[model samples]
Target chain A: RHVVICGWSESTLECLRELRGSEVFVLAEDENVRKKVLRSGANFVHGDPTRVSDLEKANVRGARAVIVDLESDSETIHCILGIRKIDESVRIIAEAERYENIEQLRMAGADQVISPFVISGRLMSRSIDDGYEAMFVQDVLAEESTRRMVEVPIPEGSKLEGVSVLDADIHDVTGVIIIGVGRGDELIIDPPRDYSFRAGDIILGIGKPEEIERLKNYISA
Target chain B: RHVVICGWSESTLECLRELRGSEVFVLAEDENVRKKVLRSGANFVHGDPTRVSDLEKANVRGARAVIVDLESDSETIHCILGIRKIDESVRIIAEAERYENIEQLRMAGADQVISPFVISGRLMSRSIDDGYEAMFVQDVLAEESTRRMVEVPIPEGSKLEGVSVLDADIHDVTGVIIIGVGRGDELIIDPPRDYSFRAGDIILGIGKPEEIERLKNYISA
Candidate 1:
């Protein structure tokens, strides 16, 4: 089955480049997107994926997976629902610029919905907190970007609970560094000076993917 | 903030599979859902997403994005409007079974609304029925397919105005087949061979995908 990647955006283009040599169909309303995808070494066709003609041309009937990344939430849903009508069995991954639209995308038959900014924020929260430490250590999945970031909240107990950034020995033991921390509504990035971690805090951190996994293990495991 | 998604069902399970690699946080109330969600592979907690304690425990305050997928429309909207009380900026995407409820979803701060059955049924009606084909496609863009469709009012002057389908070479020059012709409220799918492509006659045909592209091009392009 072919893969259909819809939309023509910065992230879409970035994602398209990652799937080079793979069978992917790009659906974009703008001709520029088609040109950009072609120049970037990805296959693309100009058409509205939500439209039957476009979907058929993309051969959505046989598409195993489709990444729908229209510029906004409405179009994403429109395209996804259209795809669902054409073929419900096909997997869909849609993008929403804002987190508020994730469910709309989901209900539109999107197998997955991605909100990049919110995702980055979640990772930032995870680093500043400890609850996610175990999950991070045990799980490693963030869309694109290989910087090795994870988001976790601080939970009660464990060796690292109620510890400070300077004393946690996080960098030493896990080789992962706290990229940022969020306490309630507050956020501190690349902290300098003595800063302590507390319960209910969100932590965003990075390391070699494996080290981050171990850090998560210590918290959730 | 942890990413919090509401509801647990087939759609939710499917969405979870995609969000799993991202290590998302999910809130589920159904006992089976809680178990299924856990097994589906996301960092999930079992609790009613609508409950404050549950949401707070899910770390609603720190959630970067929150999706409300409750089965009941009122429950979904209530969750959306109230979610902001926890963190006013959490992205909210919602779903609605009926178009009548869209306004409610909007007032509740749902960034986008999905009315699946309605949208799909309309499109399907056009593709499969006779009289309803033009009625539906008119609301959408020019469609492209092998033998195609175009809903043009009986023009004041047209070559095909007085020509019959067979004599007009409707199947020859266009290399298309007329699936339905909307003459007023009535649509004639598989119109008789002698049917006229008359003035005010909205034609739904099966033709080349490219010709449809050229016909229904919208401003977005």
Candidate 2:
């Protein structure tokens, strides 16, 4: 299955580089970008993504997914709308330059909307502490094309406090691994199955975001 | 220590929300943004971040850190330069709208430069093969307010392949926990100490960002 990408900006180049061996179609209006796309061994259609006909000509109708990374937020919204109108079932991932535009893209029928600035804020905020590990995690997370690390605090009065790793059955229920336990500045990596959770301790788990959320809910439950 | 933030965009607001109880100042040009800053319990100065006087008004000279989150790449570069001139020792984190500007910001005396759009491309490209865990990891990494999960592949024909978990000494060397071993769609979580690595197996380790890189480099070496 082929993925159709709109725009020819830096983000587009980045996505193209990662999809090097995959079937991708680029919709661009610039000659330089078209040349770049061709050089990268991807199909290119010289047209406007805001126009449904242009996107249709690029075979977006049968595409596995459509990703929009235009320069302007309005252009991105329009491109997403165009793609959604052609095929409501096709997955559409739109880029939001502004955080507020995330919902607007969703309302326009984008299946996923990513904002770089908003995410940048999260990374910048991670500097509030001096943990080398946290800083490294932030850097890795920023480059994450996939996978994540999440910290779940064992709330002070939560039921999970004093619970044993084996009894928690976190992996069986949520599919997340209890990778580390953080108490103050100390990290207990690959904690023993009999290790008991403490109220002030934090459970650092590795898993998909949803699974982490599920495990977090379970821990709090 | 106070952190100085320039500009008043969604990213600035997002960053401010994370520094709720921390000492921070916002150098903004607009009244609406000043109101938002005050509402968030952070100090806001009605001045331009590109100017020395405005930054001084925000007390950038004595700040522990200066973060520039302006709309334009050039403006961010200028802000970092402004901060550096006022205080050579203060840590400066700049936001880069374009990837090329990262080096420019660094040259301008920024200790760190974050490009949100560039990182967003990584998240968008993870559609290669769908896995809830990887998708979840992307989401967590994107929001990585505190933790990170990383995937490191056990290279073919490497000494680590067919090695037992007990002898790998990965946790001892890198401060990262071996969360799981991935073979196709199956995951072996909390693998027994005797678990032997097979060819083509991917090791899923959870750690602070820097430690994971250390382990990855060691594994590749």
Candidate 3:
């Protein structure tokens, strides 16, 4: 299924890049932005994203995910509400311009609320304490970074289903460090050694490409 | 030394919270924002941050760090230029509203340029791939998070100096996973097991509070 992106911004452009392999549909009010979206190789639907008709034009009901990155928080909230009203099953990811509005956006029906400035503020503060911490973050997110932070699901009947984190011996087995374990919606960061693994648990780890591959292979086997 | 912050926004408010213990000076053109900055417990300088006179009022030359979070990228660049012209040594951490303008801001002399949208875009993309990855990021950065990502310098004459990452046995000894090694301005992520530790290297790790404290104790001793 195609991903539906509302509004146009630099962040949306980058999102389009990241979702290259996925079919993407972008809704924009401006003709200029429509061309840009087309140039970026994503199908463009020209309309106001806050309007239900415009959202329907983008096929929001059929989208696998709907990303709202409108100019303002209120507009984003309205857009999310419109998308949710149209499609109850599609994943909604909305961006909040202000950290205080995060909850408002979440309540508006955004499954995930992302505040760039909030994240940036934390990073800036960390940079002030120690530039290296921020640099390490940049390195991990860089396009050319050899290291990757990935999440792999522990499938049903998998060998790791009943294993404890300590007993799994992940690091020694695959050289990938388990940073967190996602149990449903809750992410347990730096999980205790005794934390037990479940079939649906998503294991988050950090390692080089090959290491992550090895970890995935180990998990599946 | 004091930290000077330019402009006011939600991110700036979060930054203020993070730099609570530090002496902070905020430069704002709007009188309403001045009061808000004052209410936040930071010294408020009433003037446009891009102007040298306003920057001087904030004592930018004497500040340890200068954060630029102006409304627009152009204003941020102008403010950074003013700060750099005033003090060549003060650390400049600027926020770029658009990802495309990152290099332009960097060329303007910002030591670190943070684009909340760019980071958010990456997180959003990862979330679409697997919601767990983004949830993991949120967990790591949460204020109440038990886990911490820290960068501690390897001091000279320390036991870790000249030792390989594997030989240091940091994970087993301190229960902290080495994520990266910051050697000067470069961050070597997922470094090789045999990668030698240098005295000035900033070792980045992910661990719980006690584990991080233990890491610091081990590094210093």
Candidate 4:
């Protein structure tokens, strides 16, 4: 399945970088955007994301997910609504310029609404209070960093399926620490010792690349 | 010590909210911005931040840190230079509208540069590939979250000062997991087990609010 990205901005390039090697489509109405998208090796659809016809042209209905990151909140909300109209089941992740528009974006059918301002502000404030806090966050997200956060889903008949969190011995066995567990739409942060694992649960862990690889191997074993 | 924020944007409101209890000074030329800053309980300085005289009006020389988040990269760079002229030692955290401007902002004397586009794009892309990755980041930074990432400075004469990473038993004792070790300007992510603690080293850990509080108390004890 392909991922559809709506709109164009500086962030669009970063998103493209992150989704490298994946079959992705970019929707753009400008020539410069078309050139940039094509240069990035992503298929470009010539149209606006806020129109249902344009969303169809990008095949958003068949997409695995749609990313809406327009320059303005109103544009993003409209784009999200258009995508939902075409594909209600496909995941829609959007960016809001203002913090106040987060809930409105969510209500407009975006599965997740990310506000750059809110995140930047919070990180800046934390950096002012404690110098290392923002640095830690930046390190965690940086692609070149040794340590990274990985999400692995528990497959059916996996070794971790029937184990409790404490008994899994994840840290001792794989050297990866479990930070959160995603069960359906709910995310359980810092799950308790007695929290038992299930087949569909997604584990969010942090460690070095090799360590996280070991965790994946251990989970499937 | 007061925090000085230069320029204004949607993110400025969130920054103000994050630094609620701190004495903050905001520099703005517009009347609406002046009203907004005052309503947020921060001192407002009416002038351009790219001018040395304007920075002095905000008392940037004696401020703890200056946050340069102007609307444009050129403006932010000029503001950083002006702040550096006034206070060569004050930390300058700047925001870059484009990734290409990051190095230029750093060379302009910004201690750290944050790119909202880069962060937002990475997060949106991750959310498309892995459902919980962006959510994990949001939860870590959200003020309402019970689980939080905290930075604790190891004080002299504390029991943890000389203890190695493995021997400290921080997770067992305080129920917090150490994610990174900050020694001076470098951040050591996923430090080795043999890494010994020092008095001035900062520990970045994640856990419940109470768990982090316990770790802080243990660090100073």
Candidate 5:
């Protein structure tokens, strides 16, 4: 009926905000954090999360989920171990600063071990790629949606080099539609079928990853 | 013509992997990092990123985007300033270690400032919430897609409470389809219209964010 939160960090703060309508008891050591947690309308059990009694006070046995969002990796694992000992049935989701520690936390009974840096790194990669096309093509492909976009290059020695777009007929083989082509510093969308392919041209297509992967071999052929 | 990457970190490594089909010049002083960058098929410049000479030697003036992925906020800012002096028109994206320094980087000529910790925190919060319904409802809504799935609660004292699903007819008002409902710890998909709404029931609906926001009042009505 309730979710128990361990430690206090930005991620935990965000969790408190989004997890409204649920009873949450925050176990935090810092007096400042405890006050913030209380202000967010959650019960605050003022104690170190690494302590067993502190976890017990949070009523871990009756909790639906135990979240560990601590700053230190060692402390997060310690908190998970403490909570796991109290209630093995309850779900334990933890954030690991070091990716290598994810397995250790999972082994300690954490249902999910997430690394925030890796998540953020993926978003950053998408943002950087967006700058290239003056559009969010990379992001359009990364989504869980059915449609996907990929950037492919025409190798210099490929037979398709200097071939007209109409003659190439990449769509028939790849089951992907070519939406744009990168020639030098310019990106041309819906180029006339007669538009010829240069050796170093980059093609942007929309479809699944596998469909785009097949396009590479066909274009190289 | 090239994307200039400064500093060496996990974020940069992910960038190199995603930034295929484009020319990249990595500026890293460490021999091991330079070797790793070269193996990834990118040109490596061995020198301090903060140095103006090193940035100049990397052909910063001819770069398409100068990305500063340094660990230190001060160093990232310093590197941005060095590159900005060479090319004012090229896009500049940076990663901030500290959230407070995000504005500072933008003021220092960084076109975009990304903080991975905050990004990672959002994902962790979503994972914790999924434990309640055994699904990633929050994640489904957070993505950049036309359609979205969200988890909403039925508040006590609302007129909708104790009302049958067919009689309630929430779809007409909210413009969202109720796909599932969470009664306590169990989630039921495509519940019969006879399934009555109880106070504290978590409703999983699909629609746009704006449409879901409007459901807040109706569910409590």
Candidate 6:
């Protein structure tokens, strides 16, 4: 149920953000990355993820998964071995940045070895020339105290133009909250229920990410 | 032999900055986009890239490569078809956001399609989890004006915390502009005279590929 994610790189951070609240422990050698991990609103253990002692300090014994990352292949492999040695039940998710590094990560006991670069070129090409999609494998567990998550930008000549927030059938349809409006120069932080949204207004809202996604159909839309 | 490019997103804006002073013509529908692209020092045109007349506005006739975003695929496809109808030999460097549409983009007449998401994800995961190597790739691309980029935040209690930018002992630091400071809860754009950075202060700099690699070593140190 809980995961101990190692390394402070962006991938780990991103995964951590998506798995924000449900017991994900971030482990990184760099303090800066650790800070980002903490800022990601998850439990973070600052230490060399490869070190057996560090893993122990982070209480990886009962972890649901072990995700290793942005360190030397030797370091992460050893960390993976260390994690597996202590708790074999934990699912292991590791990242290999290169196609060449995949075997090494796999040998290190990673259940999943993600080689992002191999396909990166293709991924970027699609988004540039057309509106496309990248369905996240998991719902982002991103949320925290004072954290605001929202998105609603009306396309030009959108059908939603002239519709009030209440009448847009948003809550029942999208599950995303309509917190405010961004028209011309102003950002209405928390607009009233009766507030009407213009066709081009960028509506904002605040809530749990999934709730917001449900409201807006983030993954599905 | 300078090549002309089209469009300006966060990614393309950086490309425009890299290709500054080149004989590139930007095609954008928004006045704001045109202004920003122009500010990056590239020649620009205001017209729908999908239109034949608009492509002519950017002098697409003699163009070397026409780049388009992955999200704008439909428009880009139309634009490419229109361009091919005019001059079929112009190389199209396209942007793609998904893999499923790669063939479609190819069929649409793109010589190359780049996807920023895949690139960023691949590069970012590696860079964060495996620092120097990713930095190495970044450095290798330093000579090219338009390459991948990222903003890595310095954490509190970093080794570089006590040093100022000048004292950081950075080498090969040409054209790496310390653009902005993302201080907590505030942003100092083009920070003022006598600006001195602390350890946790993130230095936004620009340079050719290798220069940034050198910069990353110093800052990350």
lDDT of 4 by residue, B1-221 (tens): 78998888888888887686567998987768877888978889899888889899888987888888787789998888888888889988877778788888889898877776787788788887565877777677644366777788888778788888988878878888788888887888777778989889999888887898888888885
Q: Write the per-residue lDDT of candidate 6 for residues A1-221, one digit (tens) a residue.
A: 66676776533534554454467677776776656666767877778777889998887888766667654556767888888888777666665544455677667666655444333332233222221111111011011122233445666656666666557655345544343466663554334446766656665543455666565442221
Residue by residue across B69-140, what tens digits does model 1's lDDT show? Answer: 666778887777667768777766554445567677778786545443232222221111121222212211
Candidate 2 CAPRI grade: incorrect
Residue by residue across B42-138, what tens digits does model 5's lDDT show?
A: 8898899999999998878878777787867899889989888888887788766555666787899987666554444444454453422111211
Task: Mark the 10 consecutive residues where model 1 chain B has the least summed lDDT.
Answer: B136-145
lDDT of 5 by residue, A1-221 (tens): 78887887655565687676578888887878867787889888888899999899988877878788887888988888898788878888876655566678789888766565544444455555343211121123212234444567789778888888778866656666565576674555445667889988877656666778888887784
Q: Candidates sorted by DockQ, descending order? A: 4, 3, 2, 5, 6, 1
Highest DockQ, which number? 4
Give each model a TM-score: 0.32, 0.63, 0.90, 0.93, 0.51, 0.35
Q: lDDT ranking from best to worst?
A: 4, 3, 2, 5, 1, 6
Clashes of each: 38, 13, 0, 0, 1, 47
> Considering chain A alone, what is the TM-score of candidate 4?
0.92
Evaluate residue B109 in candidate 2 and report its C-alpha lDDT on the 0 to 100 scale.
90
Q: What TM-score, to 2 decimals, does candidate 6 have?
A: 0.35
User: What is model 3's DockQ versus the real complex?
Assistant: 0.61
* True-vs-predicted CA distance for residue A180, candidate 5, Å: 28
Candidate 3's residue-wise lDDT over B1-221, tens digit each? 67888888877777887687668988888778766777778888888898898899889987889888888889998998899898888899987767668888899998987666677777877787566776656656534355667788888778787888878888778888788788868887767788988888888888787888888888784
Model 6 RMSD in angstroms? 23.3
- Per-residue lDDT over B1-221 for candidate 6, one digit per residue giving the tens place of the 0 to 100 score: 33555555545654554454447677877778756766766787887778889888778786655666534557767878877777777767765545455568779887655443333333333222222233223332222124333333565666566665545433213334343455552444334434566666655433345666656665564
Kindly indicate the candidate among 1 and 4 with the higher lDDT. 4
Instruction: Measure candidate 3: CA RMSD.
Output: 2.6
How many Å off is the CA of A44 in candidate 5?
A: 4.6
Q: Stretches of candidate 5 above 4 Å error?
A: A20-23, A27-35, A43-48, A51-54, A57-59, A72-75, A97-105, A129-221, B20-23, B27-54, B57-59, B72-78, B96-104, B129-221
Give me the candidate number with maximum TM-score.
Answer: 4
Please give fnat for model 1: 0.00
- Docking level for model 6: incorrect
Error of 5 at B188 (Å): 34
By summed lDDT, which 10 consecutive residues of candidate 3 chain B come out lowest?
Answer: B136-145
